[PDB]
Amino acid sequence: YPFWAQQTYPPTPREPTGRIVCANCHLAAKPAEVEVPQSVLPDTVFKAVVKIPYDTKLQQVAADGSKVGLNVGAVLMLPEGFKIAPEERIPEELKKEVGDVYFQPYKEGQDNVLLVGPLPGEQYQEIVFPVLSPNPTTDKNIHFGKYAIHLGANRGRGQIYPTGEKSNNNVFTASATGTITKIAKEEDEYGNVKYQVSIQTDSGKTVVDTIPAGPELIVSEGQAVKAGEALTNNPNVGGFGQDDTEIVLQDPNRVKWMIAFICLVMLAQLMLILKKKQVEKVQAAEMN
Amino acid sequence: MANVYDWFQERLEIQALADDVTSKYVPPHVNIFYCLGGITLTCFLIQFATGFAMTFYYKPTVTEAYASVQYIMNEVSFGWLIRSIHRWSASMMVLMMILHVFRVYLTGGFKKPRELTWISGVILAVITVSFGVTGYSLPWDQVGYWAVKIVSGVPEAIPVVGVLISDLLRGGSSVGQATLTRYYSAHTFVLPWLIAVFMLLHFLMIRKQGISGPL
Amino acid sequence: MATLKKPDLSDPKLRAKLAKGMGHNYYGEPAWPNDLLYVFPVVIMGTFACIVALSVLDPAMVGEPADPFATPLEILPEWYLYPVFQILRSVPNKLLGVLLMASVPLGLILVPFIENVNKFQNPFRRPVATTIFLFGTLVTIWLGIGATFPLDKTLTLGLF
Amino acid sequence: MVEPLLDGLVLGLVFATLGGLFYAAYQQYKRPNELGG
Amino acid sequence: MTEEMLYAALLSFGLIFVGWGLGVLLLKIQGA
Amino acid sequence: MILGAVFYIVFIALFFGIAVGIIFAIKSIKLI
């Protein structure tokens, strides 16, 4: 979860390569988008939409085994002193689509990298960030310009605990290599079910191989398929996205003179072509 | 006054210049796309002006390169204009030039009397792309530093020379300060002179031989 | 009206030129005033305007500073480079693609030798070009788009 | 890094020109000649 | 992020035409 | 989109105005 990102990787969610640490545990890949407009003006509330699509009507494996809906997380990282819009200022239908979300900052001070989630899958198909542009006229190391924004979003539960052990939403190899002896089925007054399998004859050969509850097995009886294998099948309907995107923090002034300089041009251009015409005419008095 | 035109006219025969200009005509199969050329050129002059403007702030040194680009953006007056224009106009030149390749080819402007022109055109083409690859990595940031890293490896595939070529290219065995050094000399002193000698032929021929004919 | 001048086909000199592949700038709208003086500046000024405009509404990024230990995933070259880089990367032969690059230039030179077998300009009159051109112009674009994509929904361009 | 705006800029004009290019070759290859080659 | 490109394509292409027509049209309004 | 489309129409429109207009003014005080 977004929090254990923070928890495990304190000063940043992204490495120098652009990865985003999240992808260390969430092993699946599924697409993530991130729209925001092409330009904002300074001091402005504006929307940024995170997208995290997954096929709504299907289910993943849970802790113990059940077979439950699922949840989107996501860290987004806005450019320098962008921050979530202060709330008197979000206006209205926006309040509404933002919903009930928690925009938590990746470390004290960095308001511009926000963790978000675990939200529940079905209303958080798309996730809105109401955000507000800095103002380079008043914060004196914010300049106008074009800047990057990076999302990495994930949806559905992951493959490794922040503690270092495997979850059950992956798929177990087979330790050594030989002929299997026993598909037991544990369920001790707690920590539920437990398919207990093991291999043999060859050389040494009695190694034991438990495998949590909620994968399948699709490897049955007899057998010996080699060095850590098939046995499980793939529980994991989950997984992780990434997106980068540009945004220009524009200054209306630049826009204003630009527009002026253009008309100044268009005008000149017609004015020449006008001249030319007036010459095509003094010329017609020079063939005859 | 005390006639100025004359003064020159006496000495230099300034006339011939005009009589030479004004005595040239434009055939009617010469339609809009026969601007592609001059546009690609226009683009390039814009390069040369904005480019040289940046040589007053850019540091081609591995500590200061990247920082300095930021100064340009950021703190020099119109830094962003200047640099951004450099950036867009690179692209417009690589493109308008592809567009002009198309009009030449589907006009067979490259045909007999003119095969030299087409040949020079292609060299211009290669020099422009190099203007391109080199410029791109002077900011000595993440994307540009890997481009030098890849494209300098490429030469090395070639068997006898090829390593040796790569070392000239990058100034040692591995991309480093010599590289930004050499890349700068390249983008700002070699390429421009090369590009001019060869636009010089490309225009000289064209002037001598007049535009291809009609379809 | 326009403004005009008819080839004067009685002129030995012009004739001898038309002859050679070229008296072509001798007949037509006069190029002083007419086309330099008046419309030039239009083309130049427009060209400038667009580029300024572009530059103002969508300026230059500055990206991260260079890290000798990181390759950034998502590294492309510039665009006009895609096509080649496409090739370069669907060609397990190192040495090969490099030749294959080089050919774009070499080949491109070869053209007016080859295509000199005859002599028409207009491509309508010259089927066999207009094809291998259309052909290649197309592969080029398609190889182009090719890196806008991921490794291997790459050539299939993700539809087969 | 990919650059959208430009990429449309490109195909846009590329096609548009390939377009008009063949379209004049035609206009021209059908009105033929004029003034005597 | 891929419909910035679309628009651009789209109008790079379309707009040509418009300018075209528009000048042609001028052209009429004055008579070649 | 809808907004450009308008501003756009008006903007060309308007220049197209000046264009045509100023031919004529320019025609009939006989300069062209």
């Binding site: 003006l41 527009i259 253009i262 | - | 305007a49 | - | 528009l22 000048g23 | -």
Partner: peptide, 29 residues
């Protein structure tokens, strides 16, 4: 928050007018 839009239109309009002007200007193709 759409001088921003007037913004781009201004580009579109030169692109247009420029072609426009060139064709008008040379009975254009």
């Amino acid at each position: 928050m759409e001088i921003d839009v007037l913004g781009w239109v201004a580009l579109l309009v030169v692109f247009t007018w420029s072609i426009a002007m060139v064709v008008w200007g040379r009975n254009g193709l």
